[PDB]
Amino acid sequence: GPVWRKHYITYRINNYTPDMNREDVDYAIRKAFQVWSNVTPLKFSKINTGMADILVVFARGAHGDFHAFDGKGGILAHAFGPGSGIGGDAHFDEDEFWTTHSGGTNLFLTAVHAIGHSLGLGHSSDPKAVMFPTYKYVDINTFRLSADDIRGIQSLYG
Ligand SMILES: O=C1NC(=O)[C@@](c2ccccc2)([C@]2(c3ccccc3)NC(=O)NC2=O)N1
Ligand SMILES: [Ca+2]
Ligand SMILES: [Ca+2]
Ligand SMILES: [Ca+2]
Ligand SMILES: [Ca+2]
Ligand SMILES: [Cl-]
Ligand SMILES: [Cl-]
Ligand SMILES: [Cl-]
Ligand SMILES: [Zn+2]
Ligand SMILES: [Zn+2]
Ligand SMILES: [Zn+2]
């Protein structure tokens, strides 16, 4: 792909944004993984110790890779495709204001997109797809992947 060569994938939250209650961050990240397990045989486990496949990091500016962040706006997050070490990891720009609601940038929606990259998906050219390369705020209560996103991930895993 690269794709993960297993269906049991671990993640760990490296650090928490002070923008949100910790329980809200946990829920947003858990649900973002669940979106993808809903349409594939992938199974994600949150681990609290040891080395996870996907490390979730909040950082600002230059943060140890070739993808330095840019302050508020613009780059919200980036993620590496499947592989060892930094492979799979998902980084969120701390200069954004992360929220559960309509203010700032919505963490769950950003994480669904970032995790798609952590799984090996590229971008969609369809403006309505979750994997379109522009952030779009939508209602979480009615949230669904587009057919294009579903076809993409199932091609990789299903
Ligand atoms: O304009 C963008 N800013 C983003 O962070 C990004 C994005 C993030 C979450 C959801 C949709 C879009 C994007 C990005 C980041 C840096 C430069 C360009 C795009 N980060 C990413 O993982 N895919 C992207 O398209 N697109
Ligand atoms: Ca499943
Ligand atoms: Ca990793
Ligand atoms: Ca930014
Ligand atoms: Ca912040
Ligand atoms: Cl922390
Ligand atoms: Cl599952
Ligand atoms: Cl778990
Ligand atoms: Zn980048
Ligand atoms: Zn990074
Ligand atoms: Zn993207």
UniProtKB/Swiss-Prot annotation:
Induction: By exposure to bacterial lipopolysaccharides (LPS). Inhibited by dexamethasone. It is found in: Secreted, Extracellular space, Extracellular matrix. Zn(2+) 2 binds at H113, H117, H123. GO terms for biological process: bronchiole development; cellular response to virus; collagen catabolic process; elastin catabolic process; extracellular matrix disassembly; extracellular matrix organization; lung alveolus development; negative regulation of endothelial cell-matrix adhesion via fibronectin. The keyword Protease applies. Found in alveolar macrophages but not in peripheral blood monocytes. One of its GO terms (molecular function) is calcium ion binding. The active site is at A114. It comes from the Eukaryota. Ca(2+) 2 binds at D53, G85, G87, D89. Zn(2+) 1 binds at H63, D65, H78, H91. GO terms for cellular component: cytoplasm; extracellular matrix; extracellular region; extracellular space; nucleus. Ca(2+) 3 binds at D70, G71, G73, I75, D93, E96. Ca(2+) 1 binds at D19, E94, E96. The keyword Protease applies. Keywords: Calcium, Disulfide bond, Extracellular matrix, Glycoprotein, Hydrolase, Metal-binding, Metalloprotease, Protease, Repeat, Secreted, Signal, Zinc, Zymogen. Belongs to the peptidase M10A family. The conserved cysteine present in the cysteine-switch motif binds the catalytic zinc ion, thus inhibiting the enzyme. The dissociation of the cysteine from the zinc ion upon the activation-peptide release activates the enzyme. May be involved in tissue injury and remodeling. Has significant elastolytic activity. Can accept large and small amino acids at the P1' site, but has a preference for leucine. Aromatic or hydrophobic residues are preferred at the P1 site, with small hydrophobic residues (preferably alanine) occupying P3. This is Macrophage metalloelastase. It comes from Homo sapiens (Human).
